[PDB]
């Protein structure tokens, strides 16, 4: 139907991307080439119209180019309405807000994608800072997302610099609600929103006329607390200076991110950071590499953030901070074999590691098995009301919960499949310790056999001599007897290491769940059905009203949305969870038995060294008798 | 707009799924529940209308239920037109034909998905056979696809039994073109079409008035040839009794599939199989498990199909058939360690293997490095014509080629990443052989040291005796000297095994490409742009004509379709291929040097055994002198 146009560009009014106060953004094309561009048409521009100031201004923002900033191509005039039109680059993927609309990110973005967000936002914000221009209005809605040539997302900034001739209410600064601090505030609220999937400060009712509590929350600013939420109408505020349990970020990252947000979120400029403080700490985080470590003792995976130039000493310290294991008690295993790391080895030369192929950690000291620690979240109540807005919010909520359940279920399967491998590596690695103890035994055996034979032979050939010989014979028997005890007790250990020797990993190949079960795929199928319905309810909300047929289809699918979710949650707890807990229960059992065996093997090995020094004082005794 | 209805069901005429001669299939819903069903409305039913015979008939097909057969729910009458309507189950994913429409499957389905097709088609066809009903019309178009609860595809049959009261031209049997053989023919043509992505018998022009050649091709039926294609207008026919190089199936599967299709594709019932012969061989293939084996010698991955009850002897034989390695020369490596397999060990108890984590094979005999063998396919010419049909076919073709290139590129990266691991395992495993040779050396050393000392001491204490002593001393020096040679030559081998010892895997961590490059992701981005344009051209073909704007957008995108493809192909050959060939070239180098070292380590190890039996004839000589 009706559509605006320009000298070089044209677009339909049906194609809308963003609707702002001063301008609107449409999906447009170049009249000649046909390439897609973002069309910024200014609404209500008469009482201003500074074609003198805005001329050079738009010419300045034109030459301004950055990877983390939405590019401005040209400034043109609408054909009929004669409105000024800016030509931005089209971002098909939408904004960060669009990403947060996804149920998969209802409880926070994936860790890698979050690192992309942090890096790009900082880069773009820094580039704006170097030009002196201040934003203050930074929100996921105005942070665009594009797909790079390498496939990875790239985030850019677009809406700014409109404060000249004239922040979001949830992203507003306390004193500004009614200094460069006002910047970092919205940035912090954004970062928490990307990590948690929700806003830092939430009243029970929300952003309304009962948002009076919110201002009290924001002006509250207790210590270094990064979030505060009241769980009831006009109730107390639950404060926390840490990340939620449902957060998809690794523990190592949360340790670094927590102080950052805490220092940039307060009304006082006293303790608040500057852009240099902020940039320094943030870039520091971005420069660090990733160390994937799976602790078998607690059955917990870890991501340790270290610079490439750091040593293995700081590495052991950080691993201690997360796993509570002494640096001297930390033992590493990689690809079936143990790996000895020098205290001063750089992180650049570390082996290739993934979360599905990490570095296992075994300890001499007994440690409790923790397993995966997650937030148990149930489904919300589904109301029979036809409220399109309600059905949309309920759809995102309930699908987000199921998304979380499927995410946890995938993690549980990872822990089990990693556990089985780590155990298989360990039993063969300790078996190698048994293999070397056999060798050291044979050394003492060869030493024993010949040394005793000489002394048993010297009496056959060639009071005084008899007394010496007898004492030596006894001494040789004192050691050879214990050598026989160890010899057979080691066969008992080998019997344990043998298949079906009560240390076998057969239990671990039975109790838990396997990729053969396809439990994650089973959950995803129902999750896809729900996700489809969700985006449909979004499409129905935009129309504000539906036809009779669409009305009942909306109701039918809404009921199926519940049935899908319950079916998934039931399969989650009755299959994935229970079999995981059983695998974890028997995990403690095998751990006790393994550490006990390891203690036995240790002692029996050291005893060979104890008798190794004894035969060195005897083989060089009589054989080395002095005479002219 | 206008839409048909029923007592219990209703649908729009715009919603079309399949358009047949006697009936049409629409997307419909139940008036009460609102669930989606397939609506089969019979066109032109007057001269027949056997409400006596078809009554019981449709009642029979009603109770007929199977996982591999599209379920019939009810038989109802249209409200106005009074036409008979069948209620089938709705298959959102479409048919196998729809799957073949995908550029990803332009050169054949993935191996796993093909196994699903084979298993389901056989299962459904067998179920129809047990009821006596014959199809003959089996085509990917009438083979529906649904997504099971576990996520895996499930294929079903739908259109049959319409031959009572009354095959596709490309799927037609030679004698039937102008016995149960007519069944297996179309089945074979279907199976080849799923494996190759193309039809078995293709004239140059195609299925037209020049299809006269085709009938000659079909009546040709030379030997056990499974395909025949003329590459020029009215030219000779290129015959082949094997699968194309571009086929995505494993070599092990092709060996099994080839005789199956060959025996079921001929006009003569003399050599043609029956349903029992067909079912027996096919089910046999389906029962077999998968063995993933990566041969480092030829740098080739393999999938060996074996029954779970078979032994390791037949395993070694099949591995020999593919890798050309003698059963005694086949050495297995898994998870960093070598694995010894007993000749009679069942396949059920084999370790867990994937294509990304297979069982490596090393050999004593020198073997040439082959690497990945694929079909080099270039882009087709893009014509400036606005032909919507032409633009659609060209889109699928050119996108299919790029899909193949990205598939090969993914395989190349797999080979390199597997190579690096296999090499790293090997250098540490042979290092273990060095570790055990050191132990055997120390055994001879302890034997040497004490044995010689006794004989060197006997002369100090306690013509005839002198002569004996001297001869013994010399003999002890004959062995101890060579012991010194081996001792130092082993340090040279250890020097080789040490980092930077010319056997290091540093070259392999440099020359080839890595997942860090994200080359596959780079290709996929351009592949997504092309795929989007492809499905768009499909959408434009259905309209038969476009508006002026849509017309030029079609032309713009068509040109961008070329630019995307060329950009991907350039990045494929200039980055992925070249760096792969360089990695393969230096692969031969390290292989030579490794096998040479392995030969040295072997000899130097066996020499320790050669001198081990020599010291057993001397240590028990003088020490064991006889006397009363
Ligand atoms: O500049 C602004 N604000 C920033 C946002 C708008 N600006 C741009 N937006 C895109 N691309 C884009 C975006 C969003 C969503 C989508 N697609 C969807 O999810 N949709 C849209 C229809 C319904 C579902 C594509 N490129 C460039 C730009 I610049 C202002 C708007 C009004 C004053 S300022
Ligand atoms: O029974 C028949 N023939 C078998 C085929 C038709 N039958 C069924 N088809 C579906 N589902 C389905 C199928 C195909 C394609 C799609 N979707 C798409 O790719 N489309 C459609 C619009 C354009 C893109 C969904 N379920 C059930 C059935 I039964 C006959 C048709 C006429 C005589 S016999």
Q: Alpha helices, DSSP H only, in B268-387?
A: 275-287, 312-323
Half-sphere exposure of B188 (CA within 13 A, CB side): 28
Beta partners for residue A294, in sequence order: A301, A360
Is the CA virtual torsion A332, A335, A337, A342 positive or negative? negative
- Distance from C-alpha of B475 to C-alpha of B471, rounded to nearest angstrom: 6
In a 10 Å sphere around its CB, with 0-12 CB exposed, 13-18 middle and 19+ buried, how is residue B189 labelled?
buried
- Distance from C-alpha of B494 to C-alpha of A134, rounded to nearest angstrom: 63
In a 10 Å sphere around its CB, with 0-12 CB exposed, 13-18 middle and 19+ buried, how is residue A45 labelled?
middle
- Distance from C-alpha of A561 to C-alpha of A571, rounded to nearest angstrom: 16
Contacts of B435 (CB under 8 A, 6+ apart): none
Structure tokens at B412: 């190349």
Beta partners for residue B238, in sequence order: B229
User: Beta strands B153-157 and B143-147: pairing type?
Assistant: antiparallel
Backbone angles phi, psi at A565, to 5 degrees: -65, -45
- Distance from C-alpha of A149 to C-alpha of B521, rounded to nearest angstrom: 8
Contacts of B191 (CB under 8 A, 6+ apart): B117, B118, B121, B257, B260, B261
Residue of B12, B15, B150, B440 to mutate when probing chain A, most A C-beta within 10 A: B150
Sequence-separated contacts (24+) of A564-567 with Cβ below 8 Å? A564/A402, A564/A526, A564/A529, A564/A530, A565/A379, A565/A398, A565/A399, A565/A401, A565/A402, A565/A526, A565/A530, A566/A379, A567/A526
Half-sphere exposure of A224 (CA within 13 A, CB side): 14
Residues of B in contact with A151 (CB under 8 A): 518, 521-522, 524-525
A438 touches chain B (CB under 8 A): no
- Distance from C-alpha of A319 to C-alpha of A304, rounded to nearest angstrom: 7
Contact between residue A182 and residue A176 where contact means Cβ atoms under 8 Å apart: yes
CATH of domain B386-628: 1.20.1270.420
Q: Check residue A54 and give left, alpha or beta (phi > 0: left; psi -120 to 50: alpha).
A: alpha
**What is residue B16's three-state secondary structure?**
strand
**What is residue A543's three-state secondary structure?**
helix
CB atoms within 10 A of CB A36: 15
Take atom 11 of ligand 1 and give the residue whose Cα is closest: A91
- Distance from C-alpha of A325 to C-alpha of B397, rounded to nearest angstrom: 58
- Distance from C-alpha of B45 to C-alpha of B56, rounded to nearest angstrom: 18
- Distance from C-alpha of A486 to C-alpha of A607, rounded to nearest angstrom: 9
> What's the fold here for domain A287-366?
Ubiquitin-like (UB roll) (3.10.20)
In a 10 Å sphere around its CB, with 0-12 CB exposed, 13-18 middle and 19+ buried, how is residue B379 labelled?
middle
CB atoms within 10 A of CB B169: 9
Given the structure tokens 């030829």, which residue do they identify?
Answer: B298
**Closest chain A C-alpha to B281 CA, distance in angstroms:** 26
Q: Please choose, from the candidates B205, B134, B125, B218, the residue with its C-alpha nearest in 3D space to the C-alpha of residue B169.
A: B218
Contact between residue B287 and residue B307 where contact means Cβ atoms under 8 Å apart: yes
Beta partners for residue A541, in sequence order: none
- Please name the helix (run of DSSP H) or strand (run of DSSP E) that holds residue A38, with its range, or none: strand A36-42
Torsion of CA A235, A241, A247, A248, to 10 degrees: 170
Q: Please choose, from the candidates B287, B257, B597, the residue with its C-alpha nearest in 3D space to the C-alpha of residue B437.
A: B597
- Distance from C-alpha of A288 to C-alpha of A348, rounded to nearest angstrom: 11
Beta partners for residue B306, in sequence order: B289
Q: Please choose, from the candidates B258, B172, B167, the residue with its C-alpha nearest in 3D space to the C-alpha of residue B214.
A: B172
CB atoms B521 and A428 under 8 Å: no
CB atoms A522 and B151 under 8 Å: yes
End-to-end CA distance of chain A: 123
Contacts of B229 (CB under 8 A, 6+ apart): B201, B202, B203, B237, B238
- Distance from C-alpha of B360 to C-alpha of B421, rounded to nearest angstrom: 10
User: Beta strands A72-77 and A84-89: pairing type?
Assistant: antiparallel
> 3-state DSSP helix/strand/coil percent for chain A, to nearest 5?
50, 15, 35
Contact between residue B332 and residue B342 where contact means Cβ atoms under 8 Å apart: no
Full 3-state SS string of B571-583: HHHHHHHHHHHHH
DSSP conformational letter for A69: B
- Please name the helix (run of DSSP H) or strand (run of DSSP E) that holds residue A154, with its range, or none: strand A153-157
B31 touches chain A (CB under 8 A): no
**Closest chain B C-alpha to A442 CA, distance in angstroms:** 8
Return binding residues of A for ATP: 17-25, 40
Name the residues of B annotated as catalytic: 137
Structure tokens at A232: 């009831």
Q: Please choose, from the candidates B310, B294, B308, the residue with its C-alpha nearest in 3D space to the C-alpha of residue B250.
A: B294
In a 10 Å sphere around its CB, with 0-12 CB exposed, 13-18 middle and 19+ buried, how is residue A47 labelled?
exposed
Given the structure tokens 């949309």, which residue do they identify?
Answer: A392
Beta partners for residue A11, in sequence order: A28
CB atoms within 10 A of CB B85: 25
- Please name the helix (run of DSSP H) or strand (run of DSSP E) that holds residue A551, with its range, or none: helix A548-571
**What is residue A220's three-state secondary structure?**
helix
Q: Check residue A108 and give left, alpha or beta (phi > 0: left; psi -120 to 50: alpha).
A: left
Contacts of A78 (CB under 8 A, 6+ apart): A4, A5, A6, A41, A84, A85
Given the structure tokens 């670094």, which residue do they identify?
Answer: A256
- Distance from C-alpha of B581 to C-alpha of B575, rounded to nearest angstrom: 10
Beta strands in A498-561, from DSSP E residues, in sequence order: none
- Distance from C-alpha of B407 to C-alpha of B247, rounded to nearest angstrom: 11
> What's the fold here for domain A91-286?
Transferase(Phosphotransferase); domain 1 (1.10.510)
> What's the fold here for domain A3-90?
Phosphorylase Kinase; domain 1 (3.30.200)
Structure tokens at B191: 């199976």
**Closest chain B C-alpha to A262 CA, distance in angstroms:** 34
Q: Please choose, from the candidates B425, B315, B295, B287, the residue with its C-alpha nearest in 3D space to the C-alpha of residue B358.
A: B295
Contacts of B362 (CB under 8 A, 6+ apart): B296, B297, B331, B333, B426
A window 263-292, beta carbon within 8 A of B = none
Contact between residue A85 and residue A40 where contact means Cβ atoms under 8 Å apart: yes
- Distance from C-alpha of A197 to C-alpha of A401, rounded to nearest angstrom: 12
Q: Please choose, from the candidates A326, A302, A582, A246, the residue with its C-alpha nearest in 3D space to the C-alpha of residue A418.
A: A302
- Distance from C-alpha of B610 to C-alpha of B607, rounded to nearest angstrom: 5
DSSP B314-334: HHHHHHHHHH---GGG-EEEE
Nearest-Å Rg of the Cα atoms of chain A is 34
- When CB atoms are compared, the residue of A447, A450, A522 closest to B149 is A522
Contacts of A116 (CB under 8 A, 6+ apart): A152, A153, A154, A155
Is the CA virtual torsion A256, A259, A265, A269 positive or negative? negative
Structure tokens at A614: 């004894």
CA B389 to chain CA centroid, nearest Å: 33
- When CB atoms are compared, the residue of B34, B149, B336 closest to A525 is B149
Helix A548-571 to helix A519-543 angle (10° resolution) is: 150
- Distance from C-alpha of B93 to C-alpha of A525, rounded to nearest angstrom: 13
Structure tokens at A373: 């620690």
In a 10 Å sphere around its CB, with 0-12 CB exposed, 13-18 middle and 19+ buried, how is residue B484 labelled?
exposed
- Distance from C-alpha of A480 to C-alpha of A467, rounded to nearest angstrom: 20
DSSP conformational letter for A74: E
Contacts of B333 (CB under 8 A, 6+ apart): B339, B359, B360, B361, B362, B422, B425, B426, B429
A437 touches chain B (CB under 8 A): no
| Residues of chain A with a following break (C to N over 2.5 Å) | 166, 178, 462
Contacts of B323 (CB under 8 A, 6+ apart): B293, B295, B297, B298, B300, B302, B330, B361
CB atoms B33 and A525 under 8 Å: no
Contact between residue A365 and residue A299 where contact means Cβ atoms under 8 Å apart: no
Given the structure tokens 């898994």, which residue do they identify?
Answer: B334
Contact between residue A220 and residue A212 where contact means Cβ atoms under 8 Å apart: no
- Distance from C-alpha of B302 to C-alpha of B321, rounded to nearest angstrom: 11
Given the structure tokens 């993934």, which residue do they identify?
Answer: A354
Contact between residue B612 and residue B440 where contact means Cβ atoms under 8 Å apart: yes
Is the CA virtual torsion A400, A404, A405, A409 positive or negative? positive
**What is residue A290's three-state secondary structure?**
strand
**Closest chain A C-alpha to B524 CA, distance in angstroms:** 8
Q: Please choose, from the candidates A346, A336, A408, A406, the residue with its C-alpha nearest in 3D space to the C-alpha of residue A374.
A: A408
Sheet with B201-202, side-by-side order of all strands: B201-202, B227-229, B238-240
Please state, in angstroms and as integers, the Cα–Cα distance from residue A14 to each residue in A27, A127, A256, B280, B487, following that order. Answer: 9, 34, 45, 60, 84
Q: Please choose, from the candidates A195, A230, A192, the residue with its C-alpha nearest in 3D space to the C-alpha of residue A211.
A: A230
Structure tokens at A609: 């060294």
CA A279 to chain CA centroid, nearest Å: 22
Contact between residue B50 and residue B60 where contact means Cβ atoms under 8 Å apart: no
Q: Alpha helices, DSSP H only, in A151-211?
A: 174-177, 181-196
Half-sphere exposure of A143 (CA within 13 A, CB side): 31
- Distance from C-alpha of A412 to C-alpha of A584, rounded to nearest angstrom: 10
**What is residue B497's three-state secondary structure?**
helix
Half-sphere exposure of B484 (CA within 13 A, CB side): 7
Cα(A91) to centroid(ligand 1), Å: 7
Q: Please choose, from the candidates A184, A211, A155, the residue with its C-alpha nearest in 3D space to the C-alpha of residue A277.
A: A184
End-to-end CA distance of chain B: 123
Half-sphere exposure of B391 (CA within 13 A, CB side): 28
Q: Please choose, from the candidates A270, A255, A285, the residue with its C-alpha nearest in 3D space to the C-alpha of residue A122.
A: A285
Q: Please choose, from the candidates A25, A150, A35, the residue with its C-alpha nearest in 3D space to the C-alpha of residue A85.
A: A25
Take atom 25 of ligand 1 and give the residue whose Cα is closest: A94
- Distance from C-alpha of A7 to C-alpha of A78, rounded to nearest angstrom: 8
Contact between residue B42 and residue B14 where contact means Cβ atoms under 8 Å apart: no
Contacts of A28 (CB under 8 A, 6+ apart): A9, A10, A11, A15, A36, A37, A38, A39
User: Which technique was the structure solved with, according to the deposited record?
Assistant: X-ray
Beta partners for residue A245, in sequence order: none
Q: Please choose, from the candidates A41, A35, A38, the residue with its C-alpha nearest in 3D space to the C-alpha of residue A20.
A: A41
- Distance from C-alpha of A294 to C-alpha of A418, rounded to nearest angstrom: 8
Please state, in angstroms and as integers, the Cα–Cα distance from residue A1 to each residue in A4, A12, A13, A14, B145, following that order. Answer: 10, 8, 8, 8, 39
Take atom 33 of ligand 1 and give the residue whose Cα is closest: A20
Ligand with minimal distance to B42 CA:
2
Contacts of B578 (CB under 8 A, 6+ apart): none
Structure tokens at B76: 């109802």
**What is residue B411's three-state secondary structure?**
helix
DSSP conformational letter for A576: I
Residues of A in contact with B442 (CB under 8 A): 443
- Distance from C-alpha of B279 to C-alpha of A618, rounded to nearest angstrom: 78
Beta strands in A165-278, from DSSP E residues, in sequence order: 201-202, 227-229, 238-240
Q: Please choose, from the candidates A607, A442, A454, the residue with its C-alpha nearest in 3D space to the C-alpha of residue B441.
A: A442
CB atoms within 10 A of CB A516: 7
Closest Cα in chain A to B428: A337
Size of chain B in residues: 628
DSSP conformational letter for B5: B
| Residues of chain B with a following break (C to N over 2.5 Å) | 166, 178, 462
- Distance from C-alpha of A485 to C-alpha of A466, rounded to nearest angstrom: 29
- Distance from C-alpha of B210 to C-alpha of B199, rounded to nearest angstrom: 17
Question: How far is it between the farthest Cα atoms of chain B?
Answer: 131
DSSP B176-199: HH---HHHHHHHHHHHHHHHHSS-
Residues of B in contact with A451 (CB under 8 A): 450
- Distance from C-alpha of B531 to C-alpha of B524, rounded to nearest angstrom: 10
DSSP A503-519: S-GGGTTTSS--TTT-H
Contact between residue A454 and residue A623 where contact means Cβ atoms under 8 Å apart: yes
- Please name the helix (run of DSSP H) or strand (run of DSSP E) that holds residue A412, with its range, or none: helix A388-457
Residues of A in contact with B150 (CB under 8 A): 518, 521-522, 525
Task: Choose one of B12, B18, B138 to mutate for the ligand 2 pocket test, by most ligand atoms within 8 angstroms of C-beta.
Answer: B18
Contact between residue B139 and residue B97 where contact means Cβ atoms under 8 Å apart: yes
Structure tokens at B187: 């089945």
Task: Give the residue extent of every domain in chain A.
Answer: 3-90, 91-286, 287-366, 386-628
């Amino acid at each position: 139907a009706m559509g605006q146009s320009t000298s070089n560009h044209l677009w339909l009014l049906s194609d809308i991307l963003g609707q702002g106060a001063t301008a609107n953004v449409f999906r447009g094309r170049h009249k000649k080439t046909g390439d897609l561009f973002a069309i910024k048409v200014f609404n209500n521009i008469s009482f201003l119209r500074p074609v003198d100031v805005q001329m050079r201004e738009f010419e300045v923002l034109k030459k301004l180019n950055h990877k983390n900033i939405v590019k401005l191509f040209a400034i043109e005039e609408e054909t009929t309405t004669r409105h000024k039109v800016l030509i931005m680059e089209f971002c098909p993927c939408g904004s960060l807000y669009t990403v947060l609309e996804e149920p998969s990110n209802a409880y926070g973005l994936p860790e890698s994608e979050f690192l992309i967000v942090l890096r790009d936002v900082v880069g773009g914000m820094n580039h704006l800072r170097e030009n002196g221009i201040v934003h203050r209005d930074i929100k996921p809605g105005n942070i665009m997302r594009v797909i790079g040539e390498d496939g990875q997302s790239v985030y850019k900034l677009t809406d700014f610099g409109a404060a000249r001739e004239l922040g979001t209410e949830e992203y507003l600064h306390p004193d500004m609600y009614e200094g460069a601090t006002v910047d970092l505030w919205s940035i912090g609220v954004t970062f928490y929103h990307a990590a948690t999937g929700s806003l830092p400060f939430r009243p029970f009712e929300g952003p309304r006329r009962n948002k009076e509590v919110m201002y009290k929350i924001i002006t509250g600013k207790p210590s270094g607390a990064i979030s505060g939420v009241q769980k009831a109408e006009n109730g107390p505020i639950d404060w926390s200076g840490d990340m939620p349990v449902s957060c998809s970020l690794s523990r190592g990252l949360q340790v670094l991110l927590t102080p950052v947000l805490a220092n940039i979120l307060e009304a006082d400029q006293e303790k608040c950071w500057g852009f240099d403080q902020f940039f320094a700490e943030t870039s520091d985080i971005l420069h660090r590499m990733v160390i994937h470590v799976f602790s078998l003792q607690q059955m917990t995976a870890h991501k340790i953030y270290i610079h490439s130039y750091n040593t293995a000493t700081i590495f052991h310290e950080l691993v201690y901070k997360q796993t509570k294991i002494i640096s001297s008690n930390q033992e590493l295993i990689y690809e079936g074999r143990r790996l000895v790391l020098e205290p001063g080895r750089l992180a650049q030369h570390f082996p290739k590691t993934t979360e599905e192929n990490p570095i296992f950690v075994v300890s001499r000291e007994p440690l409790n098995t923790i397993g995966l620690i997650y937030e148990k979240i149930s489904l919300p109540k589904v109301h029979p009301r036809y409220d399109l807005d309600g059905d949309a919010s309920m759809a995102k909520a309930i699908t987000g919960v199921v998304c979380y359940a499927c995410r946890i279920a995938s993690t549980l399967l990872l822990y089990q499949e990693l556990m089985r491998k780590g155990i298989r590596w360990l039993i063969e690695l300790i078996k190698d310790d048994y293999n070397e103890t056999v060798h050291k035994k044979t050394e003492v055996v060869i030493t024993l056999d010949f040394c005793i034979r000489n002394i048993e032979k010297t009496v056959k050939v060639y009071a005084a001599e008899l007394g010496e010989i007898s004492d030596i014979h006894t001494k040789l028997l004192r050691l050879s007897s214990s050598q026989g005890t160890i010899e057979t007790s080691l066969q008992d250990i080998d019997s344990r290491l043998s298949p079906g020797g009560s240390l076998a990993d057969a239990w671990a190949h039975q109790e838990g769940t396997h990729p053969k079960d396809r439990n994650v795929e089973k959950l995803q199928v129902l999750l896809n059905c729900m996700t489809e319905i969700y985006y449909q309810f979004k499409k129905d909300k935009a129309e504000r009203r539906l036809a009779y047929n669409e009305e009942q289809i909306h109701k039918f699918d809404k009921q199926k949305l519940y049935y899908h979710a319950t079916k998934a949650m039931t399969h989650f707890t009755d299959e994935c969870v229970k079999k995981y807990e059983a695998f974890l229960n028997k995990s403690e059992e095998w751990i006790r038995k393994m550490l006990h065996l390891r203690k036995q093997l240790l002692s029996l090995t050291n005893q060979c060294f104890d008798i190794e020094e004894e035969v060195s004082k005897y083989q060089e005794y009589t054989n080395e008798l002095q005479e002219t």
